[PDB]
Every structure is written in structure tokens, then in C-alpha cells.
Symmetry: D2
Subunit: 234 residues, 4 copies
């Protein structure tokens, strides 16, 4: 299967599969069943910001999600990504809807990865605007870009209305050398701003930043609770 | 054919096709026949640094090549890249040998592109070492990656000996959005360090940083004076 | 006197001292009488962006001023700043009013300087929010920081009204090493966003990004057309 | 007393004040007695690199010291620096010798701090070469810069021999806004490369990256095991 590291903003509690019984942020290591979660109040129709930091030296993947009012949720998990991820990866953003839905709108996305010995390899990109033809993104499933300048990870019905059983992802075009055996520091950070909007009984399913094998594809049947990330709930 | 913008470090005077009659640096705009050149003393077997700066506001593409002893060559050309390049490009390094040869070894290469506004998209990468399997580079022709942690643009022997009739290029994997009609600033810079070494009667043929259409390939017969860049000498 | 290189956003035509007869951006080198100007449509009450670029290869001091409707004015002047500026400087923002007035509100300011090779010294600061007690800015004359996250270079009344005969500057706290003899490029850039509002159909006097000796202070009487920069209009 | 957060590269075990009985990197929070240490193989006369990372999400102050053969030592300590540091600080490098001595030579220092909320205030500096009159560094005690491009924190004799009972520090000229209550992520990193050379039975006393109140000065008698940081060994 693919190998997945993800920070999910999980708007829908699937308690059947380990979710806590609230919207949450969580850190996913090779499983949709988060290794750590924090209660998250998603603010409907508001623009949130997710910051994801992996500290290669502290061996700690950390995330915060916040909204302009001050409200933030924070999660940290101690992990050495050297033992999890392959050396080369693609990075991206994933969202899904299932029986319930929400807009999974990305308004900006940056990423910085650095491999240090004494000499550094580094990759930084920032999207503050997405083109209708955003050639440096691989769009997968239902994901689209433009002309409002946003990345729509799942189907949105152009009057702005979220569609259910949708799954979409965007990966940065270039593979990322995310760790190296000889790298003293293999750190990365990612930032994205998003607009989740739902009028549903409950919003579902969430957005994730993720790191995958290079050839990673949306697994068959990963709408809903699987966030476009996983083939199953294991 | 391809659309090419390049800064050449041309180790070989092809005075039959417009070269000045000395090793030179030059700024190539859709032709191997540089728009501006400066005399350049290539220092055999020394590590040189090339800095390329495109100032989108100043509409000036500038280049310096220097060596540790301070000796530098500078060229600037006034040009609006909006009128030359397609919106989406690949950026890369090119080198060739012909009837004469030299090593065209790249030891480092960084690039930063930024589009403002009204906000900023950016791409920055830096390579200080090149891996055997450098997945974020499209290698073309004879170009191979390290060790000695180096990018060899043209054929060299494992024991350091350059080959004639060689052409190779390395392009960053991701397409770059190099300008956009609504960009207030569409600037970029590139830097690379290189080791050109020859025991030939004359070193040839040079190294270029270039920017091409996304699908750019080595044009047939662009070994030698063309310097993996152009289909002919027009 | 101080030594001043400035990029002026001059709102008030002082035709008796060589201003053209329209609001303009200009490049000032040791004189308030710009070496080069471009006509500028100041958009009253709109948030403008100024971007300022110089490197020691092209030696072209460029500035663009743009508003989010996409109107922009650009000005460039080739000038060798090695020959103009002290090696070490402070960098700053300055603004002034005289008989006529405007708010000279800075909403953000960023600056980068670099000296490469053989390696890099760099200074980069970004202020997107100014703090009430901004310990890394030297505020001079009427300049004040909020709350409201803004820098008001010149005095604004309680009722929102800009006051005349005001001058103020903010300089970054650290000296900046603007050129170094062994450097093979020296580059700087600066960007700032600003909000000039006038209810006089006579906004005055304007805002400058400036570079000066480290001990630079507001020349006496440099309110109004002298922009907080010059002791006289020579 | 100053408030000190520091990462120490402690060459000399002062077991009577809680050092482990080996050279060590440690995390110091308001005491010379490190909250956490790791055993460190100081490679006499090799250029080492220290990397220090903290962010306010993960709140893990991590540091690694490595040498080009790939030997590294890492230490991390979870600590909420909001509760330790003043909001504004100066950042610096400190070193000392006592009865025993070592060159405490700094070959490079880079620092970045950022305060993000909605998408950022930032300070970044890098010194790869120290200038004889480095106007953006505040040198304290025995510390001296240039003409060799290095910063010698402690006294080195004309014949190359390091002197005992020496303390010197370099702080960056500007105050750094290390935390802000409205920031959702405050982060800093620091990298420095160093060359510790002893010809004796033993090297002492070590080098620290430190963060302090803006008016921080060398405490009296803080040569030796106090590393220029602390007034006592409490
Ligand atoms: C076992 O019963 C299930 O009930 C839920 C909804 O109540 C439904 O889950 C689907 O929709 C949610 C919300 O989008 C997703 O999280 C799930 O993955 C799934 O698609 C089941 O289908 C059943 O009715
Ligand atoms: C007609 O004579 C030409 O002679 C030159 C060199 O003697 C040769 O040029 C080749 O080699 C150079 C140097 O490497 C390249 O720049 C050229 O493109 C070419 O490959 C010509 O082929 C002719 O013989
Ligand atoms: C000529 O006498 C004055 O009238 C002028 C206006 O022409 C005024 O100049 C002041 O105001 C302008 C606009 O703000 C500035 O550019 C000048 O420097 C100055 O402050 C004089 O002060 C007198 O009123
Ligand atoms: C016990 O008397 C002293 O001997 C110690 C060392 O054992 C010496 O300490 C000095 O040197 C060490 C090593 O440099 C430092 O860590 C100390 O702080 C101090 O400078 C004393 O000075 C006496 O010689
Ligand atoms: Ca869920
Ligand atoms: Ca040639
Ligand atoms: Ca004027
Ligand atoms: Ca000690
Ligand atoms: Mn979950
Ligand atoms: Mn040529
Ligand atoms: Mn003017
Ligand atoms: Mn210790």
C-alpha cells in the first residue's frame, strides 16, 4: 500500500474507528487512527490556518490549527520519520466528504523541507493563489484549482455548495528528499489556510496535509472517513 | 522549437557564429548568439560560482561568474521576460563538449522564483550535493548525478577525464510559474558552482543556466557550440 | 549631512524644486530631486505596495508601487551604490506632511540584504504587525507604532485626521552591511505596504524607503517636501 | 540577574556543579546546570556544527552538534519559553576558558525567529564571515572578529595558543521578539559552526548559543564553567 504520514483536520467523529467524539486535529502515522489528537473547534465558514512542523532533531511532529479569533488546537507526536517514510516523498493536501459534506477549500499552501549535513538541500514552495492551470500541482480525484484562486480539494457546486462522496488531493509536482541517512537535520514545515463550510447536519470529512510515497494515489474507497489517505481504517 | 533564455559560461570562442574571441559569459535570448557578453577568464580546475538575477521591475537579467581569487565577469541585459518566455517553464543547467572538451561539473545549484501579486507564489530549491538517484531532477542526455555528490552535465570518466561530443542537462522536476500577466514582480535568481577542467588544446564548450518551455529536450545535434540549448546557430 | 539613497512615493508635486507636476515615485541619490521619477496614481485610501530591488551586478535600483486594482508605477535608475553609501547603514521608512497632509500609515515592511561569496552574510526582517513597543525599530520624530499593528510615520489626530508639519521615520535597529569589497554580489530588497489617506484633494508629502548612515537622524526642518530625508532641497 | 536560556557545548566536566563526567551538550534554563545533557565527543580541531531549534507548538528545545565525519550528539528538552524568556531578548554566542582552555572559534552563525498568526514578523541573520568591525554584533568581554572571517569568543594568543580565564560573547545588535501572546507559532533556530582546539589535558570550557534579556551583559566571574552566562553555579 502507500506509506502515509498526515496531519488531519478531521471535522467528523468516526468513533467506530478510533476518532475521539469531537472534531479533532490528529497526527496520522501509517494509519487513519491518529497516534495523537486534540479537540478542535472547526469554525464553519471561517478561514483557518494549519501549521505543521517536523523537528528532525527533536524527533517531533507538531501541528496547530487556528482561526483569527484566537482559538487554536495543538497536537504533537514524538516520532522519527526516518523509520516511517521513504527517503523520497511527495507532499500534498487531501480532503474528503462522505454521507456528510463540507467545502474543503485551500486558500494558501507553503512547505519547506531542508536536509542538512554541513552542505543543505532544501525545497520551499508557497501558493497564495492557485491558477486554473497550476502546473506544479498534481491534482487527484476531485481536486480542482482556480479562478477565484483557491484549491478545491473536493467537489463544490460553483454556487459554493459542498458535494458528498468526494475525494481530492494535490501533491507538489516535485518529489521531496524528506530524509537522508547522512542528514544531521531533516526538518520540514508546512502551512495551509483553508475554508471549511457546511450547512449539513454535520460537516465531514476533513482536510489533511500529507507526506506519501512519490507514486501515491488516492486509495480505492477513501472518501469519507479515510480522508483520501488510507485504503482502510486499520 | 523550444524557447530558451540562458546565461552561458562559454569556454570556447565560436567566432564563426557570433562569439567574441575569448571565453565569455553571455546572456542568450532565444538564440546561442548572445545579446550581451563579457570576457571571462575561466580558471581551469577551479571552482567557479555563477549568479544569475532577473529583476522583473528593473527588467534586467544580470549574471556574474567569479572564482575565489576575486576575478569576476559580469553581464547585464535589459529585457522583459514576459515577452520572451511562456508563463510556465522548466529551469535547468546545460553543458556540452564538442571536438574539444572539459568537465562540466556542477557542485551546487539553487534557484528562487517569486511571483507577486496581489499575493506571493514562490519556489526555492537548493542542491548542495547530488545523489545517485536525484528524483527531483530531470536528467537529459549525458547528465548524471553523484557521487562525488556532483552533477556531471557531460560525460566524464570515473577517473575525471572529460569526453568530447557530449551534451547533458538537468532541469528541476517541477514546472516553474516564471511570470504571470497580473504579477507586479516576477523575479528570479539562480546560483551554481561548477568545476570546469580540461587538458585539451582548448576547453569547450561551456555550461548554461537556462529557462525553457516545460517540455524542453536537448535539440538534436546541440553538442559543441550549441551548448545543449539550441537546434542551430541563428 | 547624512547620506541618503531613497525611493520616494511623492504625493505632492513641488515643481519649484524639480518635482514633476504629478504625484510620482522617484529614485533619490543624495538629493530630494529625484534622479528618475515615474508618474504615480496614488489611490487615496487604498493599501499600496512598494517593492524596491537593488543588486550590485545589475546595479539598477528599481522600485514598483502597485495597488490591488493592478495599477502600478515603476521607476529604475542605474547607480553604483558602492560609490554612494557607507559600507554599513541603517535602512528605514520615512514620511512627512507640510501645509498639506495625509496619513502615512505603514501596514507591513520587509527588508533583505545579502553579501555573497565566497560565503553569504544576510539580514532579513519582516514586520507584518508593528507592536506598541517595537524594540527592533528606532522610531524618529512623529513616528508611532500601535496597536493597531500599524506604523504611523506621521501624526494622525484622534478624529483620524492627518496633521500637517509632521515628519517621522522608522529605522531597523541593527546596522546593515550594505556593501562589502570582497562580496561578489551585494543585494537588497525592501517591500512595504502603506495606506495614504487624505481628505485634502492635496495629499502630502509622501513616504520614502531610505538607506542612510547608521547615525542618520531627521534633518531639522525636513517636514513637507524634504520627506524627513534631506536638510534642503538641493 | 539576567535570564538565560542556552544550549551549551560543554567541553569540560565540572562534576562538582552537576556536569556529567564527560563533555556534553546541554540545555540550560536559568541555570548552568543543564536540565538535559547528552554525551558529546568534541573532536579537537575539527569544525563542528551546532543546530538549535525551538517552536512554541512543540515547545521542544532541541540541539544537535555534529562534525563532518557524522558523529553527532543531540539533546532536547520540553520547555515553555513563554514562561522563561522576556518577550524581547538578544540572542548570542558565548564561550569561556578557566584554568584549562581551548580556542572557541566561531566560523559561522545564522539565526531565524518568526512569529506567525494568520498566513508573520521574522528576523533572520547569517554570518558566514565576520568582519573586523562587525557593526551588527555586540561583542562582549574577550570576543573579537575579522580579518580572518572568524569570531574568536575567547582570547587566542599571538602564537595560536588559547588563553585561560577568558570569556567573550557576541549578541546580534537588534532585539529579537522571541514570543508574542497573539502569535500562534513562535519559532527560532540557530546554527553555528565552531572550531574548538586544545593541545592540553584538557579543553575548557565550552561554547553556548544563548538567549537573554536585551541588556544582558557578561556576569562578573563567569569565566570557566559558567560559560559567560551565569553569575554562579546555582
Ligand atoms: C454504519 O452507519 C453509517 O453511518 C454513517 C453516517 O451516519 C455513514 O458514514 C459515511 O459518511 C460519513 C460522513 O461523511 C463518513 O465519515 C463515512 O466514511 C461514510 O462515508 C455510513 O455510510 C453508514 O450509514
Ligand atoms: C570546419 O572546421 C571546424 O573546426 C572546429 C574545431 O576545430 C569544429 O568545431 C567543433 O568543436 C567545437 C569545440 O568543441 C564546438 O564548439 C563545435 O560545435 C564543433 O563540435 C567543427 O566541427 C569544424 O570541424
Ligand atoms: C509658498 O509658501 C507656502 O505654501 C507652500 C505650499 O506651496 C507650503 O509648503 C509646505 O507644504 C508643502 C505641501 O505639504 C510641502 O511640500 C512643503 O515642504 C511645505 O511644508 C509652505 O509651507 C507655505 O505654506
Ligand atoms: C579547585 O581549584 C581549581 O581547580 C579548578 C579546576 O579543577 C579550577 O577551575 C577553573 O577551571 C575550570 C576548567 O577551565 C573551570 O571550569 C572553572 O570554572 C575554573 O575556571 C580553579 O580555578 C582552581 O584552579
Ligand atoms: Ca473522522
Ligand atoms: Ca562557444
Ligand atoms: Ca514632493
Ligand atoms: Ca563544564
Ligand atoms: Mn480522526
Ligand atoms: Mn557564446
Ligand atoms: Mn519628488
Ligand atoms: Mn555542563
Amino acid at each position: 500500500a502507500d506509506t502515509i504520514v498526515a496531519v488531519e483536520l478531521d471535522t467528523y467523529p468516526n468513533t467506530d474507528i478510533g476518532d475521539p467524539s469531537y472534531p479533532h486535529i490528529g497526527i496520522d502515522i501509517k494509519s487513519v487512527r491518529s497516534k495523537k489528537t486534540a479537540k478542535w473547534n472547526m469554525q464553519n465558514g471561517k478561514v483557518g490556518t494549519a501549521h505543521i512542523i517536523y523537528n528532525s532533531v527533536g524527533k517531533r511532529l507538531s501541528a496547530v490549527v487556528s482561526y483569527p479569533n484566537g482559538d487554536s488546537a495543538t497536537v504533537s507526536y514524538d516520532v522519527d520519520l526516518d523509520n516511517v517514510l521513504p527517503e523520497w516523498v511527495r507532499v500534498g493536501l487531501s480532503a474528503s466528504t462522505g454521507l456528510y459534506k463540507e467545502t474543503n477549500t485551500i486558500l494558501s499552501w507553503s512547505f519547506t523541507s531542508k536536509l542538512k549535513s554541513n552542505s543543505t538541500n532544501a525545497l520551499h514552495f508557497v501558493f497564495n493563489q492557485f491558477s486554473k492551470d497550476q502546473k506544479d500541482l498534481i491534482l487527484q480525484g476531485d481536486a480542482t484549482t482556480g479562478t477565484d484562486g483557491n484549491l478545491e480539494l473536493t467537489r463544490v457546486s460553483s454556487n459554493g455548495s459542498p458535494q458528498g462522496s468526494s475525494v481530492g488531493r494535490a501533491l507538489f509536482y516535485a518529489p521531496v528528499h524528506i530524509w537522508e541517512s547522512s542528514a544531521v537535520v531533516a526538518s520540514f514545515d508546512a502551512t495551509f489556510t483553508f475554508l471549511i463550510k457546511s450547512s449539513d447536519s454535520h460537516p465531514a470529512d476533513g482536510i489533511a496535509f500529507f507526506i506519501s510515497n512519490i507514486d501515491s494515489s488516492i486509495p480505492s474507497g477513501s472518501t469519507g472517513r479515510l480522508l483520501g489517505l488510507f485504503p482502510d481504517a486499520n
